């Protein structure tokens, strides 16, 4: 019934020293029924990464919409969109559906190509921006993720340390949520290299 918890799933994003990390589980379900273990919730437009939890049809629709918009942006601006600008675009796009919203929990992550500054941001389904320094959480195990992140996180982690922190934050949060899990992906993002790691986890 509740659109934001029909399909399930989670996204978490963290900042580190000269790097950001964004991670998601791979589950798509119809309530109790597990349907897909390959439903990736993180996308990227140039160097800007977008995670989206919530109703899966809207996750797909918004990805296609932001691909659409960032492609036109690039053609006109003659440059790739930045995380700060994209965050405003996500907010604008969600709020234009104020009284008929996409049932999603988007999470932006990336590094500004000019300043080199790590950036993350979260949104509610309606466009309100949460621009946290430390971490952003989203999905059906957001409480669990808040608990994990709040204790596990420390500032200025190196890329390979940040990987361990965000992975453990995701995994253990997902294992306390019926509608999350079935695999996981972690993106470690640096100014000019991005590493994508699929995690091994319990498949129940």
């Amino acid at each position: 019934s509740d659109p934001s918890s029909i399909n399930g799933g989670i996204v978490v994003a963290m900042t580190g020293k000269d790097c950001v990390a964004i991670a998601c589980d791979l589950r798509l379900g119809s309530q109790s029924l597990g349907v897909s273990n390959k439903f990736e919730k993180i996308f990227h437009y140039g160097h800007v990464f977008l995670g989206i939890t919530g109703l899966a049809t809207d996750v797909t629709t918004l990805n296609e919409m932001f691909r659409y918009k960032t492609n036109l942006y690039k053609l006109k601006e003659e440059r790739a969109i930045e995380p700060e600008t994209f965050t405003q675009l996500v907010s604008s796009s969600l709020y234009e559906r104020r009284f008929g919203p996409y049932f999603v929990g988007p999470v932006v992550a990336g590094i500004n190509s000019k300043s080199g500054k790590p950036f993350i941001a979260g949104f509610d389904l309606i466009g309100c921006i949460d621009e946290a320094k430390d971490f952003i959480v989203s999905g059906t195990a957001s409480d669990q993720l808040f608990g994990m992140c709040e204790s596990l996180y420390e500032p200025n982690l190196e890329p390979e340390d940040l990987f361990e922190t965000i992975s453990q934050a995701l995994l253990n949060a997902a294992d306390r949520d019926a509608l999350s899990g079935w695999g996981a992906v972690v993106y470690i993002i640096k100014k000019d290299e991005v590493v994508k790691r699929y995690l091994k986890m319990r498949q129940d």
Binding site: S5, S32, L33, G34, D175, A178, M201, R202, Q203, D204
Partner: protein, 212 residues
């Protein structure tokens, strides 16, 4: 929840998952869904956890009083009917119960009774109860034979819970196995689904859809 029990040549296999949820929140992964009524009788837990625990524990007290008075082991038929008659008195009050009363006696042999909070009492050879019951049934129905060995029967029960644990979001954690004989039940261990899944995937070649 996923609980099953089936009759076979060597007695009864009882297999259950271990997950308990409150909505989407996984409250516990270490729940005991097999109630050890007494050394000879087992009951499964589905629906209301308290209702199953309380009344199947109470159950063991009634059986103990029976065999003290009658100087004889209570039958699985009489056993299951004490429970079904009890819950039937409460019908409408809102008890939530779906259980298999499992036992092996001289006069009856291996017997399983599905007992219900609606007052249903069904004798049968294979029963599966819970949110993941349909997944377990599939594995059971396609692989079940009366002439299964105790080893293969135990694995079939384990594998059928694994099938449900994987697909059903409200099932998982670990698998508890029991083997019921005439001289009593025998516990066959707690098996973490996480470790069991990968083990079964490799050794069996199943779950090719899943990347390991």
């Amino acid at each position: 929840t996923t609980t099953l029990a089936f009759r076979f040549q060597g007695g009864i296999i009882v297999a259950v998952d271990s997950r308990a949820t409150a909505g989407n929140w996984v409250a516990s992964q270490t729940v005991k869904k097999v109630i050890e009524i007494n050394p000879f009788l087992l009951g499964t837990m589905a629906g209301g956890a308290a209702d199953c625990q309380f009344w199947e524990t109470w159950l063991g007290s009634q059986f103990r009083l029976h065999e003290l008075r009658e100087k004889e082991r209570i039958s699985v038929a009489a056993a299951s009917k004490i429970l079904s008659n009890l819950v039937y008195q409460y019908k409408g009050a809102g008890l939530s119960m779906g259980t298999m009363i499992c036992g092996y006696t001289r006069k009856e042999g291996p017997t399983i009774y599905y007992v219900d909070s609606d007052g249903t009492r069904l004798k049968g050879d294979i029963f599966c109860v819970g949110s993941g019951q349909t997944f377990a049934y599939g594995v059971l129905d396609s692989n079940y034979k009366w002439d299964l060995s105790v080893e293969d029967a135990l694995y079939l029960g384990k594998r059928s819970i694994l099938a449900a644990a994987h697909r059903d979001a409200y099932s998982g954690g670990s698998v508890n196995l029991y083997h019921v004989t005439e001289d009593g039940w025998i516990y066959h261990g707690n098996h973490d689904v996480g470790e069991l899944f990968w083990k079964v995937k490799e050794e069996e070649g199943s779950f090719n859809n899943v990347i390991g």
